[PDB]
């Protein structure tokens, strides 16, 4: 029991953690791409509202 | 600048302080009476003068201090005697000559004319420093080498470091320049009583306090930084435990905050503490006062000073902890502080909540207790200190229904539950094992396992034995000891032996004056082994009582075995007694 348990445990958790880290890095990359795409639009909208003034 | 305008008893209303801050101390009149600012209505302020307000004349100047209630810390804080408002009583008596406390004394808390041998650290003159750095160390005395550190909330590039020489407190030894400006720092420093000392990170308590008494050390362990409450009001047993803590406990230093108690009790304490002396592991004799800062506040003293004395003491303890030393703070009477609080609340006309106490009593009390724990210091080098509070509860009428008692019990982790009945039962420790509880038992897991793996099981079995004993007492009162089963009779006899020898420590005899953890644990192991191997043996009750009487005598000899005979020798004697009891019980059956 203990031998088979340690054999199964030694590596699977580390591989799962590495896969999760890789997936998180990929998601970070996608988010960075989206932010780069939307950066100037957001900046222009903010500038418009700051500059836009009445009364 | 600023003149009094309305002087109505304790409260004094003065105009002119447009810039006064809320809760800023201020000096009033020629006599320089001290008062706090409460209400800042318009351009005027409100001063509650602590001392007597008689004799004040209108337009008497009022001088602002630019500082909330603060205690001047640094070297030389130890040994001396201080009032609730941080006034050095001994130096006041020496300088003034007269006995009474003059109305308007202005003696500084620490005499800046005394010279201390200042030894700086190897820090570079052109280095960079931040708050909490142990930039030097001063030999304020023996046994309490004062590790002076750069003031918290101050970070800068050091410009000049003083050499190793005899300097006064007024003399400056440090200067730093983070921005363009360079600010010099002296050895003395100040901190408000209310705001706690900055701490990098509170830590989980891991190591226990060794009180030197077997009952508290074994049955109900208290961690470093663990809150403890004593229900002591008569018989001075609380003072006895405080003296034991001062003499033998693990605290690198101890601060006793006596507030609102009778003058005679304060005088008795002020004579008793100097008489006590603490033995080093080296064995040569050194007085406890050199490592003890005592703060006394009698009933004659102003109420506000009595209320603030607790925060004064806890701030001193916080300074010691930030200096990286384990420290214990003892409050003589929390109920006296509650009385001071109710008096102040009545003076300021707050809405009563429960039995006259102000509503905020729970919050203030909880904050004060919560200012104590194991702490990772600020700055470097990284060291850990601990403040543990053993504040004593003194319920009037001995009823737990008192709001202060209920709040403390809600907050306190360990309640040692001293009972006057045990004192009436000729028990010197007078620690009621039943009504007392320990909540830090799980915290001692690593320490107990490292010291003795079976110690946890022994403690659990001892608690079960105490419960079985309290049941068997009324069981015997019902019908008699004979009706009990043989194993139940053994259990009752072993519980009686435990209470008579292990639980009850005389502490008057030199052999039992200090009970180490090793000796207490070995005595508990011997008792539990004798009880166990007797319970499995049954054979008869009377028959084994006679044939194992030698085993009982050997177990009682563990109490005779003392550290005064030597710790390795005491351990060997306890092991031999346990082996003899084991052989006597096994061979007979």
């Amino acid at each position: 029991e203990f031998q088979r348990k340690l054999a199964e445990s030694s590596g699977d958790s580390g591989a799962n953690v590495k896969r999760l880290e890789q997936e998180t890095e990929v998601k970070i990359h996608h988010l960075n791409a989206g932010a780069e795409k939307i950066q100037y639009d957001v900046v222009q909208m903010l500038l418009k509202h700051v500059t836009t003034v009445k009364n | 600048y600023g003149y009094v305008r309305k002087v109505s008893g304790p409260v004094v209303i003065a105009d002119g302080m447009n810039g006064a801050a809320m809760y800023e101390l201020v000096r009033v009149g020629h006599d320089n009476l001290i008062g706090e600012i409460i209400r800042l209505e318009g351009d005027s302020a409100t001063i509650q003068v602590y001392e007597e307000t008689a004799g004040l004349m209108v337009n008497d100047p009022v001088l602002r201090t630019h500082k909330p209630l603060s205690v001047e810390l640094g070297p030389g804080i130890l040994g001396n005697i201080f009032d609730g408002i941080q006034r050095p009583l001994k130096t006041i008596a020496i300088r003034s000559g007269d006995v009474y406390i003059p109305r308007g004394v202005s003696v500084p808390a620490l005499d800046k004319d005394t010279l201390w041998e200042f030894q700086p650290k190897k820090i570079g003159e052109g280095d960079l420093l931040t708050g909490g750095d142990l930039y030097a160390t001063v030999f304020e005395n023996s046994l309490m080498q004062h590790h002076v550190a750069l003031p918290p909330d101050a970070m800068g590039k050091v410009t000049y470091v003083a050499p190793a020489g005899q300097y006064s407190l007024k003399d400056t030894v440090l200067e730093l320049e983070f921005q363009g400006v360079k600010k010099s720092f002296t050895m003395l420093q100040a901190w408000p009583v209310r705001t706690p000392r900055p701490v990098s990170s509170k830590l989980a308590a891991d190591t226990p306090l060794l009180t030197g008494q077997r009952v508290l050390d074994a049955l109900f362990p208290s961690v470093l930084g663990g809150t403890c409450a004593i229900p002591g009001a008569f018989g001075c047993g609380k003072t006895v435990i405080s003296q034991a803590l001062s003499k033998y406990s693990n605290s690198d230093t101890v601060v006793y905050v006596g507030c609102g108690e009778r003058g005679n009790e304060m005088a008795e304490v002020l004579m008793d503490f100097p008489q006590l002396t603490m033995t080093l592991p080296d064995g040569r004799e050194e007085s406890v006062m050199k490592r003890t800062t005592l703060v006394a506040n009698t009933s004659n003293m102003p109420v506000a000073a009595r209320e603030a004395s607790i925060y004064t003491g806890i701030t001193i303890a916080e300074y010691f902890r930030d200096m990286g030393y384990n420290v214990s703070m003892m409050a003589d009477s929390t109920s006296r502080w509650a009385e001071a609080l109710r008096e102040i609340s009545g003076r300021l006309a707050e809405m009563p909540a429960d039995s006259g106490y102000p509503a905020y009593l729970a919050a203030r009390l909880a904050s004060f207790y919560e200012r104590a724990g194991k702490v990772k210091c600020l700055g470097g080098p990284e060291r850990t200190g601990s403040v543990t509070i053993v504040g004593a509860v003194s319920p009037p009428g001995g009823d737990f229904s008192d709001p202060v008692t209920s709040a403390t019990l809600s907050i306190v982790q360990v309640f040692w539950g001293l009972d006057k009945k045990l004192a009436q039962r000729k028990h010197f420790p007078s620690v009621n094992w039943l009504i007392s509880y320990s909540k830090y038992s799980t915290a001692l897991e690593s320490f107990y396992e490292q010291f003795d793996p079976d110690f946890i099981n022994i403690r659990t079995k001892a608690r079960e034995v105490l419960q079985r004993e309290d049941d068997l007492n009324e069981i015997v009162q019902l019908v008699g000891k004979d009706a009990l089963a043989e194993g139940d009779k053994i259990t009752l006899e072993t519980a009686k032996l435990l209470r008579e020898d292990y639980l009850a420590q005389n502490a008057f005899t030199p052999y039992d004056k200090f009970c180490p953890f090793y000796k207490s644990v070995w005595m508990m192991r011997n008792i539990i082994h004798f009880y166990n191997l007797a319970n499995q043996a049954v054979i008869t009750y009377t028959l084994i009582k006679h044939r194992l009487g030698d085993l009982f005598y050997r177990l009682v000899s563990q109490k005779f075995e003392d550290p005064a005979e030597g710790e390795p020798a005491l351990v060997a004697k306890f092991k031999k007694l346990h082996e003899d009891l084991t052989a006597g019980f096994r061979a007979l059956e």
Partner: protein, 157 residues
């Protein structure tokens, strides 16, 4: 084994929490970069001279109206200080036009640092008791908080 596999479960939980909090930290860093870019673009707009003058007059007029004070103390940056001195009582006339009233006294001089001030006007009131602070740098980071939900909506993927 049962009481040990809790350690593996805790390790998995810690890894997941670290990953997600790192992702959220990246998102917040992107938001901070957006704020910095907005500030830089605001400074670039402040670099304008002629069209940049009209908004200053509008700010002065609107601040006078909302404050509704009889006397104010305006402070401007050294850059466009000539511009605001040229605006002068044109803002007061515009305020009297918005609501029929005698124009208040206008006083302009100390200036904050150019990039730090980023234009704007601090109209304030007498004795400095009441301050209507309208720096473009201060006007920004107020718009930012209001538009943050809109930005989070914009960030889809």
């Amino acid at each position: 084994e049962k009481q040990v596999e809790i350690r593996k479960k805790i390790e998995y939980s810690m890894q997941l929490n670290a990953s997600r909090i790192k992702v959220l930290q990246a998102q917040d860093d992107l938001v901070s970069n957006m704020m910095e870019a907005a500030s830089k673009e605001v400074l670039n707009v402040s670099r304008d001279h002629n069209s940049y003058k009209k908004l200053l007059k509008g700010l002065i007029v609107q601040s006078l109206l909302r404050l509704k004070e009889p006397a104010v103390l305006l402070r401007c940056r050294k850059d466009d200080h000539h511009l605001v001195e040229s605006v002068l009582e044109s803002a007061k006339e515009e305020y009297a036009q918005k609501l029929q009233v005698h124009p208040p006294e206008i006083i302009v001089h100390h200036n904050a640092h150019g990039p730090s001030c980023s234009g704007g006007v601090v109209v304030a009131s007498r004795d400095g008791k009441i301050v209507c602070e309208n720096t473009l740098d201060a006007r920004l980071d107020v718009v930012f908080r209001k538009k943050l939900p809109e930005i989070r909506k914009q960030l889809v993927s």
